Design an enzyme around this catalytic site. Sequence first.
Site, short mmCIF file in Angstrom:
data_model
loop_
_atom_site.label_atom_id
_atom_site.label_comp_id
_atom_site.label_asym_id
_atom_site.label_seq_id
_atom_site.Cartn_x
_atom_site.Cartn_y
_atom_site.Cartn_z
N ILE A 83 -8.13 10.05 6.47
CA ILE A 83 -7.00 9.63 5.64
C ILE A 83 -7.50 8.77 4.49
CG2 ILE A 83 -4.82 8.40 5.55
CD1 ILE A 83 -4.62 8.96 8.65
N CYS A 84 -7.11 9.13 3.26
CA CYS A 84 -7.40 8.32 2.08
C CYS A 84 -6.23 7.38 1.85
CB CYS A 84 -7.65 9.21 0.86
SG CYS A 84 -8.00 8.26 -0.65
N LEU A 85 -6.44 6.08 2.10
CA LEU A 85 -5.36 5.10 2.01
C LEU A 85 -5.96 3.73 1.73
CD1 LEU A 85 -2.35 4.42 2.32
CD2 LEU A 85 -2.74 4.26 4.80
#
Lengths: 148, 140
Positions: A83-85
């Site tokens: 996840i890119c966060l």
Amino acid sequence: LPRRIIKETQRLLAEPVPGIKAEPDESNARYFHVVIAGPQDSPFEGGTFKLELFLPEEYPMAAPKVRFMTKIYHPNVDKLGRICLDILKDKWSPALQIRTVLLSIQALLSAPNPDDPLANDVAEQWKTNEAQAIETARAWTRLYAMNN
Amino acid sequence: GVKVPRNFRLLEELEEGQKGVGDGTVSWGLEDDEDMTLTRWTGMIIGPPRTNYENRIYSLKVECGPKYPEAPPSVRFVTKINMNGINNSSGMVDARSIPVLAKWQNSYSIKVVLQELRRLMMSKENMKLPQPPEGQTYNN
């Protein structure tokens, strides 16, 4: 086990986040099994998405590690569920907590923005062929996130 | 004792495989880049010098099951090799013949298995075994 992890776990069980199940693993108090319902009116509506979350040794100075276990078509999620966060990387703060991470991922599903994550093939499709991208997300919701 | 769960351990091993380790004479990577279970890996060993394996590349399949890394992975050669502990019909590695598999510890990894197999290619009972011609593979 730090007292903070004990308290967070107890509060997540006693006051769960709407639309999210999150429970500690029986053998590892730092490991959480998570289910997020696809938000209403999103491309993921009707789906149930499994995630796993791990509190590394330096938590809460270090962010939790989180991954999707259910395959999902989303600008911020890669083929292995990573996840890119921002709050999972360099915008983490010890004043945030597990609940914050779960709410933030839920919000990603409700409002996919392909301009937000670091550039990638899925985000490019959401940017340039949004209609097709949404149908792919809906199709993968049926195939991977129903009866799973 | 902070235990890293299987899936997060395997993501660490994925990143390590991409960055490489040591002199690069063993390498590994995910077999299918859509395999969210992180189960099936490609292994590579460079045969060690001054042995009958020298200047040969060996491809392997490494399977990390649900109990990994509390339990060892299963390992099989794809590239044919004459080596003690490697089954002649299937390429399967007999765990009882490889000390790090027979005495597995949860601190071990795909890297360790491949490094140990390469080390054992230097042992007296293997290094002079006459090898098949290159280009042969086991079935399945």
